[PDB]
Design a protein around this motif. Structure first.
Motif, PDB file in Angstrom:
ATOM      1  N   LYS A   1      -3.503  11.378   6.680  1.00  0.00           N
ATOM      2  CA  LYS A   1      -3.203  10.898   5.323  1.00  0.00           C
ATOM      3  C   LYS A   1      -3.163   9.372   5.275  1.00  0.00           C
ATOM      4  O   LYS A   1      -2.196   8.761   4.818  1.00  0.00           O
ATOM      5  CB  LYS A   1      -1.909  11.514   4.776  1.00  0.00           C
ATOM      6  N   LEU A   2      -4.245   8.758   5.766  1.00  0.00           N
ATOM      7  CA  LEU A   2      -4.366   7.306   5.728  1.00  0.00           C
ATOM      8  C   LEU A   2      -4.573   6.796   4.307  1.00  0.00           C
ATOM      9  O   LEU A   2      -4.261   5.638   4.011  1.00  0.00           O
ATOM     10  CB  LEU A   2      -5.511   6.849   6.628  1.00  0.00           C
TER      11      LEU A   2
ATOM     12  N   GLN B   1       0.803  -1.214   0.000  1.00  0.00           N
ATOM     13  CA  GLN B   1       0.000   0.000   0.000  1.00  0.00           C
ATOM     14  C   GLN B   1       0.839   1.270   0.000  1.00  0.00           C
ATOM     15  O   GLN B   1       0.276   2.366  -0.085  1.00  0.00           O
ATOM     16  CB  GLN B   1      -0.945   0.002   1.207  1.00  0.00           C
ATOM     17  N   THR B   2       2.164   1.158   0.085  1.00  0.00           N
ATOM     18  CA  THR B   2       3.025   2.337   0.077  1.00  0.00           C
ATOM     19  C   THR B   2       3.307   2.847  -1.327  1.00  0.00           C
ATOM     20  O   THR B   2       3.460   4.060  -1.519  1.00  0.00           O
ATOM     21  CB  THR B   2       4.353   2.038   0.782  1.00  0.00           C
TER      22      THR B   2
ATOM     23  N   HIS C   1      -8.775   1.494  -4.720  1.00  0.00           N
ATOM     24  CA  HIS C   1      -7.343   1.501  -4.479  1.00  0.00           C
ATOM     25  C   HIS C   1      -6.649   0.642  -5.524  1.00  0.00           C
ATOM     26  O   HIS C   1      -7.199  -0.360  -5.991  1.00  0.00           O
ATOM     27  CB  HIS C   1      -7.025   0.993  -3.068  1.00  0.00           C
ATOM     28  N   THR C   2      -5.431   1.040  -5.888  1.00  0.00           N
ATOM     29  CA  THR C   2      -4.709   0.417  -6.984  1.00  0.00           C
ATOM     30  C   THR C   2      -3.887  -0.795  -6.551  1.00  0.00           C
ATOM     31  O   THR C   2      -2.995  -1.224  -7.292  1.00  0.00           O
ATOM     32  CB  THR C   2      -3.810   1.445  -7.675  1.00  0.00           C
ATOM     33  N   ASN C   3      -4.168  -1.359  -5.377  1.00  0.00           N
ATOM     34  CA  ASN C   3      -3.588  -2.630  -4.964  1.00  0.00           C
ATOM     35  C   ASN C   3      -4.447  -3.819  -5.378  1.00  0.00           C
ATOM     36  O   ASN C   3      -4.188  -4.943  -4.936  1.00  0.00           O
ATOM     37  CB  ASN C   3      -3.357  -2.651  -3.448  1.00  0.00           C
ATOM     38  N   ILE C   4      -5.463  -3.588  -6.215  1.00  0.00           N
ATOM     39  CA  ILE C   4      -6.370  -4.645  -6.653  1.00  0.00           C
ATOM     40  C   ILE C   4      -5.751  -5.578  -7.681  1.00  0.00           C
ATOM     41  O   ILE C   4      -6.351  -6.610  -8.004  1.00  0.00           O
ATOM     42  CB  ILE C   4      -7.654  -4.013  -7.217  1.00  0.00           C
TER      43      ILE C   4
END
Lengths: 64, 436, 60, 436
Positions: free
Chosen positions: D343-344, D311-312, D380-383
């Motif tokens: 800023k989570l 997620q970073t 989110h682009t971690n998909i």
């Protein structure tokens, strides 16, 4: 009342037996242009609720 | 005044007119042998427009029923509604006919009983000094209703020239061709007489009957006892402006005059939605008039077998939408407001169209003064699909050498087959030419 | 303040105007504005008013 | 107006939509066979947005349910909520299907029942003259929901081109591969249709269900009777702006428009915290809105199996935070005040981000007008970790010679396996490219 006077002439036409037929169609299209003149007269009225009812029903006859 | 003589004729035309007169007593509040209810004059304001006028408050029907087959009339006299009919206006007991199944039988029997067929049916003509016209309640199926019915369309055209002619004729069934095979011959011979020797017709298809008879009616074996239920209601529905007190087009020459564009274009499409008895439990909540004419132009209630993809190049010219009984007339102009927005009727590009709506109060009866009824009398130019269906089944049969030697022995010496073919194509070409 | 509650509903009309001019509930105005766009794309005429009362009444 | 037709399909898609309609009656204050409460119109200001509009105050569901297996529908009619469903809109009694377990079964059965599958589901389309769109409430697990569901994503794209498409599709389980082994094949064939033949999806993982089903729910043997409880609430939670009276994004084309960055990037992460009934005894002390959205961005309520250390380098672009019922809106801007300080959500460095919050009043009910509810619709682009998980299980299976001879006998003649592989990598490469 021009509708009444063209109906008695056309009924006389059928019992007597093309130029009169073209004269009747030009008498109709004069009435159809006169109905468009009353459509513009009713649009330029006092702009009340009675204006809206008479201008809706003559747009309605014009869509016929 | 406005007296119409119905000409019930044939094997199918007599049965569809038998329950037509039986429908009229239940809505007039009268019995076929007596008057037991007082609802006939306070509720109904006009009764002497299809019945004969009263001599003892017994409204005699102005009806004649001729058929070659005695089977249709022997199922009448045991019913308790036959005492309203008279045994001296048409026939007495033990009436018969031919053998008999031929189009040339009744076509040749018209001039051998020519003295008697123009004697007792003319006695009802001079009863009123202003006769409305004649409706030929005949059939196209079989040779009984098609053979003799073509003769009276000719000799009543000149003997009674100033009278309206218009028929509620039923079309035959074209599913298989085993029991009858003479169906393309006797149909087209009468269809020529229906256009030039007749002003208007009301078409009633047979293949579209079982489309509706299994739609909401839920039957498994199709019998002939259901053919009289869809037909007798729309017959009495068509005279609601004429029987019940209306104002505009309250005559039969009022309704037909506002729909026919031209002669030989008179085939009117019919529609009638409400036929279900369990709708009655939810019409108590003020079911309105705004939803009943949205489904008339939608091809669901139609009684005409036509193409579904042929309506884009065809255009409606005249459409009738008859509401009956409770109308709530403060929203009947609201129902006609929503017509122009959908344009469900294709309009002719050469001239104007017309969506005519009319109303009349129904019978003082509980299934009639509660449920909304919609009768449609359309006129759409896709009706040539039936004429293309009948003509393609006509020229295909003449190349198979079918009934060319078995049909020309009696009273046919020349080939009158292409006399029917060109005149049918004249109808089919002038329909597509009519929208320029 | 009790005579308005019995007869006129004065402060109920305070909440009521917020649904139309202040656009509180959007379903009254979205089913409006959906039906209202085929008339707003053309320029207005003399015959502009009699259809707008009908398109208001079938939206409510 | 805003009528949506739900397309419930498959073995799992029919059960998750069965309690979805059963959830709607408890919040509308209505019974499936009658109207016993007056809370339906004074409390709820809009009801005809998923139901069919009333004829007797009976809000018919606008639902169709097709499946090859008759077991899912035989557990319906004995329940007292099936009388609300109609036995003429979809099927009558004794409906069946195939044998049957194949992706090529329902893919080949779509064009042999092509006449009937496009006949009765189109009757509900012209009920409203402004149709919202279609939601395919189907499944990816098995060959029943994945085989036939890929066919309707193609033929409804051009026959209804101006309609919204977006599905609540459930992902299958990837724990062991003993009972089913055809899971990598039928999933990727439907996943190609979900990106180019479909606009948006709503992902629902199966391995993340039992992460929550043992989190607070405390079960020992995981059954299928718990899969309908997490799913049916968030379905009705997603239409709270659409069913209940809201102002902004009160349509289904309102919510999805403000979250999709681009086509083929539409996989939305879902979150929903409150699922425990013993929280009710301490919500009487004014539990606020300031603590309910601090845990939404915290990865605890998520229904997506993703990496924790990935997620970073990934960035949120669109995040939705839906509060329902009692909101106390004088501090809802106070809850959005605290978002920028933590800023989570990692923000995209090329463009702006958006934290959208909205509210709508819930049902007039005691468990609904007392406890705060938070519905999350993240993006989110971690998909791509799920897409890397499915692709690594896809190319490993093709090297083991698994279902290459057992799958190409029926209606498959060319290798369409790399047609799914490159298009999946096109999604995985454009996601990481999207943050420049």
């Amino acid at each position: 009342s021009k509708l009444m006077s063209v109906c008695v002439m056309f009924t006389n036409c059928l019992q007597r037996f093309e130029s009169t037929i073209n004269n009747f169609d030009s008498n109709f299209s004069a009435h159809l242009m006169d109905l468009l003149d009353k459509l513009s007269m009713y649009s330029t009225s006092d702009c009340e609720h009675s204006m809206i009812n008479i201008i809706y029903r003559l747009d309605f006859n014009g869509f016929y | 005044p406005r007296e119409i003589i119905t000409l019930q004729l044939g094997q199918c035309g007599n049965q569809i007119g038998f329950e037509f007169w039986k429908q009229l007593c239940a809505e007039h509040g009268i019995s076929p042998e007596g008057i037991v209810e007082e609802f006939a004059t306070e509720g109904t304001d006009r009764k002497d427009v299809f019945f004969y006028q009263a001599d003892d408050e017994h409204y005699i029907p102005r009806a004649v029923l001729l058929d070659l087959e005695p089977r249709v009339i022997h199922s009448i006299l045991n019913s308790p509604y036959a005492n309203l009919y008279n045994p001296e206006n048409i026939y007495l007991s033990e009436h018969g006919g031919g053998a008999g199944n031929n189009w040339a039988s009744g076509f040749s029997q018209g001039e051998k009983i020519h003295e008697d067929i123009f004697d007792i049916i003319d006695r009802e003509a001079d009863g009123s000094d202003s006769l409305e016209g004649f409706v030929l309640c005949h059939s196209i199926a079989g040779g009984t209703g098609s053979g003799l019915g073509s003769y009276l369309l000719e000799r009543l055209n000149d003997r009674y020239p100033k009278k309206l002619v218009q028929t509620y004729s039923v079309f035959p069934n074209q599913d298989e061709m085993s029991h009858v095979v003479v169906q393309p011959y006797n149909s087209l011979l009468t269809l020529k007489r229906l256009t030039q020797n007749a002003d208007c017709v009301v078409v009633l298809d047979n293949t579209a009957l079982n489309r509706i008879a299994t739609d909401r009616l839920h039957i498994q074996n199709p019998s002939f006892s259901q053919i009289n239920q869809l037909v007798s209601t729309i017959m009495s529905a068509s005279t609601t402006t004429l029987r019940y007190p209306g104002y505009m087009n309250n005559d039969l020459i009022g309704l037909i005059a506002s729909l026919i564009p031209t002669p030989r274009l008179h085939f009117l499409m019919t529609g009638y939605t409400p036929l279900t008895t369990d709708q009655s439990v939810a019409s108590v909540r003020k079911t309105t008039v705004l939803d009943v004419m949205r489904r008339l132009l939608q091809p669901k209630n139609v009684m005409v077998s036509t193409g579904r993809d042929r309506q884009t190049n065809h255009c409606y010219i005249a459409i009738l939408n008859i509401i009956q009984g409770e109308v709530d007339p403060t929203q009947v102009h609201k129902s006609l407001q929503r017509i122009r927005e959908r344009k469900l009727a294709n309009f002719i590009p050469w001239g104007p169209a017309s969506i005519q709506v009319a109303l009349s109060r129904k019978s003082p009866y509980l299934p009639s003064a509660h449920r909304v009824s919609g009768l449609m009398m359309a006129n759409h130019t896709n009706i040539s699909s039936l004429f293309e269906r009948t003509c393609r089944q006509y020229d295909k049969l003449r190349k198979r050498e079918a009934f060319l030697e078995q049909f020309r022995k009696e009273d046919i010496f020349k080939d009158n087959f292409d006399e029917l073919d060109n005149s049918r194509e004249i109808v089919q070409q002038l329909i597509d030419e009519y929208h320029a | 303040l009790d005579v308005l509650n019995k007869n006129y509903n004065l402060l109920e009309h305070m909440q009521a105007m917020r649904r139309y001019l202040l656009l509180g509930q959007g379903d009254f105005i979205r089913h409006l504005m959906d039906l209202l766009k085929p008339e707003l794309v053309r320029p207005a005429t003399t015959l502009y008013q009699h259809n707008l009362t009908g398109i208001l009444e079938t939206a409510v």
